[PDB]
Design an enzyme around this catalytic site. Structure first.
Site, PDB file in Angstrom:
ATOM      1  N   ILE A  19      20.524  24.529  65.184  1.00  0.00           N
ATOM      2  CA  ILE A  19      21.025  23.587  64.190  1.00  0.00           C
ATOM      3  C   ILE A  19      21.272  24.268  62.852  1.00  0.00           C
ATOM      4  O   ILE A  19      22.328  24.093  62.248  1.00  0.00           O
ATOM      5  CB  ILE A  19      20.077  22.376  64.017  1.00  0.00           C
ATOM      6  CG1 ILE A  19      20.006  21.539  65.293  1.00  0.00           C
ATOM      7  CG2 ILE A  19      20.550  21.496  62.837  1.00  0.00           C
ATOM      8  CD1 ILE A  19      19.173  20.303  65.137  1.00  0.00           C
ATOM      9  N   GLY A  20      20.311  25.040  62.372  1.00  0.00           N
ATOM     10  CA  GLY A  20      20.425  25.676  61.074  1.00  0.00           C
ATOM     11  C   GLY A  20      19.140  26.413  60.764  1.00  0.00           C
ATOM     12  O   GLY A  20      18.215  26.470  61.583  1.00  0.00           O
ATOM     13  N   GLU A  21      19.098  26.992  59.569  1.00  0.00           N
ATOM     14  CA  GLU A  21      17.932  27.771  59.168  1.00  0.00           C
ATOM     15  C   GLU A  21      17.323  27.264  57.872  1.00  0.00           C
ATOM     16  O   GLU A  21      17.527  26.102  57.508  1.00  0.00           O
ATOM     17  CB  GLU A  21      18.294  29.237  59.013  1.00  0.00           C
ATOM     18  CG  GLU A  21      18.311  29.976  60.305  1.00  0.00           C
ATOM     19  CD  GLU A  21      18.014  31.430  60.090  1.00  0.00           C
ATOM     20  OE1 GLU A  21      18.929  32.255  60.320  1.00  0.00           O
ATOM     21  OE2 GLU A  21      16.871  31.732  59.657  1.00  0.00           O
ATOM     22  N   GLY A  22      16.560  28.123  57.186  1.00  0.00           N
ATOM     23  CA  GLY A  22      16.016  27.808  55.871  1.00  0.00           C
ATOM     24  C   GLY A  22      14.971  26.717  55.864  1.00  0.00           C
ATOM     25  O   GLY A  22      13.896  26.887  56.442  1.00  0.00           O
ATOM     26  N   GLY A  24      12.229  28.824  58.240  1.00  0.00           N
ATOM     27  CA  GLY A  24      12.396  29.393  59.562  1.00  0.00           C
ATOM     28  C   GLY A  24      13.715  29.014  60.170  1.00  0.00           C
ATOM     29  O   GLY A  24      14.764  29.234  59.563  1.00  0.00           O
ATOM     30  N   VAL A  26      15.736  25.849  62.679  1.00  0.00           N
ATOM     31  CA  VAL A  26      15.654  24.515  63.232  1.00  0.00           C
ATOM     32  C   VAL A  26      16.563  24.463  64.440  1.00  0.00           C
ATOM     33  O   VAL A  26      17.683  24.983  64.415  1.00  0.00           O
ATOM     34  CB  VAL A  26      16.043  23.463  62.179  1.00  0.00           C
ATOM     35  CG1 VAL A  26      16.017  22.087  62.771  1.00  0.00           C
ATOM     36  CG2 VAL A  26      15.080  23.540  61.032  1.00  0.00           C
ATOM     37  N   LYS A  41      11.505  22.640  64.166  1.00  0.00           N
ATOM     38  CA  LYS A  41      11.557  23.748  63.233  1.00  0.00           C
ATOM     39  C   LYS A  41      10.459  24.740  63.578  1.00  0.00           C
ATOM     40  O   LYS A  41       9.293  24.360  63.715  1.00  0.00           O
ATOM     41  CB  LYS A  41      11.380  23.275  61.792  1.00  0.00           C
ATOM     42  CG  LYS A  41      11.154  24.430  60.822  1.00  0.00           C
ATOM     43  CD  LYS A  41      11.338  24.008  59.356  1.00  0.00           C
ATOM     44  CE  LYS A  41      10.019  23.550  58.678  1.00  0.00           C
ATOM     45  NZ  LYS A  41       9.912  23.963  57.201  1.00  0.00           N
ATOM     46  N   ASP A 136      11.006  17.599  44.788  1.00  0.00           N
ATOM     47  CA  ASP A 136      12.198  18.352  45.159  1.00  0.00           C
ATOM     48  C   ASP A 136      13.162  17.428  45.852  1.00  0.00           C
ATOM     49  O   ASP A 136      13.814  17.791  46.839  1.00  0.00           O
ATOM     50  CB  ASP A 136      11.878  19.558  46.055  1.00  0.00           C
ATOM     51  CG  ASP A 136      12.987  20.614  46.086  1.00  0.00           C
ATOM     52  OD1 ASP A 136      13.819  20.644  45.182  1.00  0.00           O
ATOM     53  OD2 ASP A 136      13.002  21.425  47.052  1.00  0.00           O
TER      54      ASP A 136
END
Ligand SMILES: C#CCNC(=O)CSc1nc2c(N)ncnc2n1[C@@H]1O[C@H](CN=[N+]=N)[C@@H](O)[C@H]1O
Length: 337
Positions: A19-22, A24, A26, A41, A136
């Protein structure tokens, strides 16, 4: 073990997709117990004490919270022993998108803006009622499913509110995302009061109205000058609330700036939306609207129902990572056989 793009989640979870990072990466995966796809994740935090902090905060808070507009943790996967534990996998409901990804390519109707804002503040009411600050809030931390149910995620920078210790000097360094920082962070605030989150929600509302961040500062003090370029010069009263001389004299050194009217910046917006925007994006954090007042604002009247806006049952590091690893191991025990 399956590998994507070293993923170790079997055999309950199979057929993984990136799916994506940041902290680790996901993936989505099929949950063979519940017969549905989920998000997983992979976290590898145990070297850097900073990672262990954010990881422990997120896990502790999300396991304690239970609210329709806050993401839950369904499962946590890790090795049976601390010795063997190198990664931790957090399993959550699969959400179609997030508000950052959505605002990159989709115009929102006013009905969607209003519904999203309602859900953001409903979730935030619960967070704040637990005496927790998210710290955040931004579009990428608002997950959305295919029916636009909204869930707040990522509590890795969250803190217990501490208003008595909020004061600090001018240009004190801060960690949370720059474009969503309230003006007082750069002046005299550590971000230890609930008003820090309301500012961020105001910025999210502005961004939903135009698909562009309202205050896209390129560096630390630049953020403050974007804010003042729209709000205009603070009043004498609001300056007088800033006792710190370095911060006050910085503001006094700037040329007079007039306010930019919200309806000139957002000429298609609902006028009630812009009234509530103004109250969220108020310079003086003591005059800024609080979450429960925001829920009661006329813009949200279609949805407002305090009996259906629940609160938490009770309120809510120097640490060497060895104790933090140990703490993470302990917090995640309930998901072992
Ligand atoms: C499990 C777990 C822990 N969940 C998080 O830590 C929040 S991230 C995230 N949770 C998602 C979710 N539950 N369903 C779908 N997608 C999700 N993403 C996406 O993963 C890439 C961004 N990653 N980051 N930061 C982007 O596509 C995000 O939309």
């Amino acid at each position: 073990p399956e590998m994507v793009r070293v993923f170790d989640v079997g055999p309950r979870y199979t057929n993984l997709s990136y799916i994506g990072e940041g902290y680790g990466m996901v993936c989505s995966a099929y949950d063979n117990l519940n017969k549905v796809r989920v998000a997983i994740k992979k976290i590898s935090p145990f070297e850097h004490q900073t990672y262990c902090q954010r990881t422990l905060r997120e896990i502790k808070i999300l396991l304690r919270f239970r609210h329709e507009n806050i993401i839950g943790i369904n499962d946590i996967i890790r090795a049976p022993t601390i010795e063997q534990m190198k990664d931790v996998y957090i399993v959550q409901d699969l959400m179609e998108t997030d508000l950052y990804k959505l605002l990159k390519t989709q115009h929102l109707s006013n009905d969607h803006i209003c519904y999203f804002l309602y859900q953001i503040l409903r979730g935030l009411k619960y967070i704040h009622s637990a005496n927790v600050l998210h710290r955040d809030l931004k579009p990428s931390n608002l997950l959305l499913n295919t029916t636009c149910d909204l869930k707040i995620c990522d509590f890795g920078l969250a803190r217990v509110a501490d208003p008595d210790h909020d004061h600090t000097g001018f240009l004190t360094e801060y960690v949370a995302t720059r474009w969503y920082r309230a003006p007082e962070i750069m002046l005299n605030s550590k971000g230890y009061t609930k008003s820090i989150d309301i500012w961020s929600v105001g910025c999210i509302l502005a961004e939903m109205l135009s698909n562009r961040p309202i205050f896209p500062g390129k560096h630390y003090l630049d953020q403050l000058n974007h804010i003042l370029g729209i709000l205009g010069s603070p009043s004498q009263e609001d300056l007088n609330c800033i006792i710190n001389l370095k911060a006050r004299n910085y503001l006094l050194s700037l040329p007079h700036k007039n306010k930019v009217p919200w309806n000139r910046l957002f000429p298609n917006a609902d006028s009630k939306a812009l009234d509530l925007l103004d109250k969220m994006l108020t310079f003086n954090p003591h005059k800024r609207i609080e979450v429960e007042q925001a829920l009661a604002h006329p813009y949200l009247e279609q949805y407002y129902d305090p009996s259906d806006e629940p609160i938490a049952e009770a309120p809510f590091d120097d640490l060497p990572k060895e104790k933090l690893k140990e703490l993470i191991f302990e917090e995640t025990a309930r998901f072992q056989p």
